[model samples]
Target: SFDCGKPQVEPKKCPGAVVGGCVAYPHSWPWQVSLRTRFGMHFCGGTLISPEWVLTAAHCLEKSPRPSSYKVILGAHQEVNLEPHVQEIEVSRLFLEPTRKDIALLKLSSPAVITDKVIPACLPSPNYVVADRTECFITGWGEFGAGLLMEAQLPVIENKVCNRYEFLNGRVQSTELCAGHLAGGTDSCQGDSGGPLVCFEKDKYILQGVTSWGLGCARPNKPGVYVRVSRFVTWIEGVMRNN
Candidate 1:
C-alpha cells in the first residue's frame, strides 16, 4: 500500500523505504529511470522531473555525449522483460553546465504518457537543504552487486564531515551531499550514477541529490556523494523556463 501520507498509488505515495530494498513494487517509484548508451548497455540512472524533462548527473554522459544515441527507460524495474508501463524516452536536447557542473537535464523528444508508473517526481524548493537526521532512500537498477531496481535506506552525512573525513579528503563540496551508512555494506555504486537520493517529507518525495561519486561501493567510512538539488534550483528552473 502507498504511504507517505497518501493512500493512493498513482502519484508516488510509498512510505518509508526498504531495508535492503528487495525488488521494488511496480509503480512505486515513478521517477526512477535507467539510462543506457547506444548499445543498450546500462550505465547510469535518471529521475523524471517533468513531462519532458529528466534529471541526471553530468558525469553520467562524460563518455557518451551524443544525445540521439542514448535512450531513457522509464517505469522498468526488471533487467529484462520490461513491464507494460515501461516507456523508452529519447532525448531531444541535452543541457549541461559549461563549468562541468555535475547535474544535467534531458529534454524528452516527446511527452511520456503519464501513468501510475511513469510520473514526474517533485523538485525541492529553491535553497532547500536536508536537515540533520533526515529520512531518505536511494534507488536504481544498478550493478552494486544487485540489479532490478535495487533500493536501500541511507543516512544523510553532514557536508563538513563529508569533506574532512580522510576517506573523502576534501572532495565533498557545498553543492553536493554525502549519504549512506557509515558502517558500510550498503550504498549506491557501479551503474548507479545520476540516480536519485530522495527523501519523503510533508506528504511528498523530493529529489534531494543526484548520485555523483564515491570511494567505492559500500566501503566503510565512505558515503556516496550527490549533487545537491537545492543549490541548482535557480539554474535548473532558469533552464526550464528559457529552454
Candidate 2:
C-alpha cells in the first residue's frame, strides 16, 4: 500500500556486505531474472517459473504500460557485472492480482533453457507449515548497511521464524512471512522484493517465500517480511498454466 513514484534511490557502496544467507545455487537458476525498469533502474527481483513466465512482485509492474517496458537479465552474478552469465529478454505479458496481492508473473518472449544449475526450486506443498525456530535463507540485491542499496551481491543472512502474531499485530498481512533479528543489523531492504526466501529441507533447497517488505532495514521492533509462497501455490500454478 505504498508507492515511491518511480524508485529513485541511488545504489550505495558497502564494504563487507552480505545479503541473505542462500548461496547463488553454485551454477544458476535458469528461471532467475534481474528485472530492470524501463529506464534501466533495478528496483526489484524476479524468478523464471516456466519457459515463458517470470515471477515477481505486482507493484514492480504496476507502473509499466506492459511487460515489454521491463527488461529481464538471466544468469548474472552481480548487478554491475552483466558479462559472465547473461541473457536479455523482453516481457510479452504480465499477470498481477487486482487486490494488491503483492505478486506478479511476466510472460517472456521466449522460453528459458532449463539446466542443472537453472532449475525451478520446489514450491512449498499445500498446507506446508514451517514450525517456529525453523531457519530460512533469503536472497536479494537489496540495500545493505545503512542509508543505501548496494550494487554488489549482499551476503545472505540467516533468519529464524518469529511468532506470526508478532508481525501480524503490526498490520503485516497473512500473505507475508516475517524474519530477521528482533534487535537489528540484518534484514532485507530496498530492491529485494520478489526475491527468494529459500529453505534447505530434506537435502534440497525449496522456495518458501518471496522477499516483500519491512518497516526499514534492520530496525528494532521491525522484522523483514516476505510473501508466503505456500499460500499462493494454486495462484502461482494457475498463472503458470494459464500462460
Candidate 3:
C-alpha cells in the first residue's frame, strides 16, 4: 500500500529532501540571500544583484499577505540550520510590472558581503540575443517541503532554444525563455520559482533569466519558462544606478 513515487500527500513527509533532490548551485552562490512571502508566511530564495539590490520575480510580491512581513536569509542552504551568513532585510521598495513580466528588484536594508563565492552574476551585454539551443543553469532554494527549502543538488540542464513563433504559439511570450526535455524528467519546479537561470558566455556565467513559471515539473511540451533578463537590462540598470 505504500507508493514510493507518490511518497506522501504532503511535502513535510520528507525530512531532509527538498523537492526530491534539486540542490542549490555553485554551493556558494549565496543561498541565504533569497526571500519569499505569502499570506503571513515569509520564506527565502533570492540572489544579490548588487551591494544594495536583489533581483526576484514580481509575482512573489504580488500575492503576499503584506510586504512588511517578508524576511531574507543571506548565504543559507537549509531552512532549520541556517548558516551565520543569513541577513534579514526589510522590503523598503519594489518595482514590479503589471503583466506576468513577473520580475522585481528588492532593496535590501544594507549591503551584502561580496566575496569570491558570493558575487553578483553578470547580465547580458547590450544588443545581445540568446538564441534557441543555448544551454543555461538555474539555481534556487524555494520550498522543497519538509517545512523548509532543503538545499537540493541538481545537474546543469541544457536549455534548448524555443523560437518566438514556437514559444508564443503555446501561450509563452518573448519576455520569457523556454527549455527542458520533451520526454520530461528534469525541470525547475514549485519552490524553484524566481531563481536564476544562468548561461556561460565568454568565460563568464551571466544571469540571463529568472524562473517565472512552468506548466509542471518537466512535463511533455512544457519546458521551464523564465523571464528573460536581457529584455529588462535598461530597467534593471536604471534601478541599480538610481538606488
Candidate 4:
C-alpha cells in the first residue's frame, strides 16, 4: 500500500489522486477501506494501517461508535461485485485519541486476511514531519456518496497561513494540518471525512493526516483541515501496543 508515485503498469498508476481528479484503479490503494453502514452502503472512508486496526477521523464514527454497527471493507474497487478479494469485518472496539486530535483507531473484530488485494499501509514516523510545501494526496469515494473512489493532489498549507484565512480566523490548531489549493480550485469535498492524506517518503507511502473538515468544499483561502496524523503517532502506537 506504500507506493511512491510511479508507473507500475496500466490499471496501476498513482493512487489517492483529488477534486479535479479522476477514478482510481482497482487495488491501487490497498490500504484504502470503506467504512460502511449497517445497510452495507458507504459511509466515511478509512485507511488500514494494520490487519486488525484502522485509522480514521473520529467524526466519521461520532454519530455511532458502536463497533457492532459498522463494517470495514477492503479490496473492492467498484462498490458492487465486492465478493472477490474483499475482507468485510466488524469493528471490535473504538479508541478516540485525546481531545482536538479528532482521530480514532478501531480494532477489527477479526484479523484481516492479507492478500494482494488487501494489505496494511506503513504508518508515518513517530516523529513525522513535513515541509510547508510537501506533496501529498487525499483519497475518498467523493461528495454525495456516488460510491466511486477518487484521489487528488494538494500541497501542504502552512498552519500559520491557514490560520490567517478569514474563514479559519485562527482556529487552526497544532492537532490539525491543512492542504489543498490555496487559490481554491480543488479540495476534498463532503463525505470524504476520515479518508487518507498520504505522501510518498523513502520507498513507501506514509500517512500524513486524516480528512477532518473545511469551511466549504473548494473555497478560496480555506483549505481542507485534516487531523494531523503525525501528532498522534505515539498515541496510536501506544493504543495498538496495549491492546
Best-fitting candidate, scored by lDDT = 4
Candidates' RMSD to native: 3.7, 8.7, 9.5, 3.2
Q: For candidate 4, lDDT tens digit of each residue in 22-133?
A: 6677676777778887778777788888878999878778778578888998876776556665888989999988767488998999988766667677777765667797
Best by TM-score: 4
Rank candidates, TM-score, best first.
4, 1, 2, 3
Query: How many residue pairs clash in all the candidates, one count each?
Result: 0, 11, 18, 5
> What value of lDDT does candidate 4 attain over all alpha carbons?
0.71
Candidate 2 accuracy as TM-score? 0.73
Which tens-of-lDDT digit does each residue in 66-141 have in candidate 2? 7679887665556664555466778888877545468777887886655443455566786475554456554456
lDDT of 1: 0.71
Tens digits of per-residue lDDT, candidate 1, 1-243, equal 222212134332223333345556656777788887767767788888877888998878788677887788887877666676678877888899655478899888888777666777778888787985576777777643355666666668787776775657787777877776555444344337888888878777888988864323433446777788988877878888898
TM-scores vs. true structure, each candidate: 0.85, 0.73, 0.72, 0.86
Candidate numbers, best lDDT first, in rank order: 4, 1, 2, 3
How well does candidate 4 score on lDDT at residue 168?
68
Ten-residue stretch with the least lDDT total in model 4:
4-13
Error of 3 at 199 (Å): 1.0
Question: What is the C-alpha local distance difference test score of each model?
Answer: 0.71, 0.55, 0.54, 0.71
Task: Give, for candidate 2, the lowest lDDT window spanning 10 residues.
Answer: 1-10
* lDDT-better candidate, 3 vs 4: 4
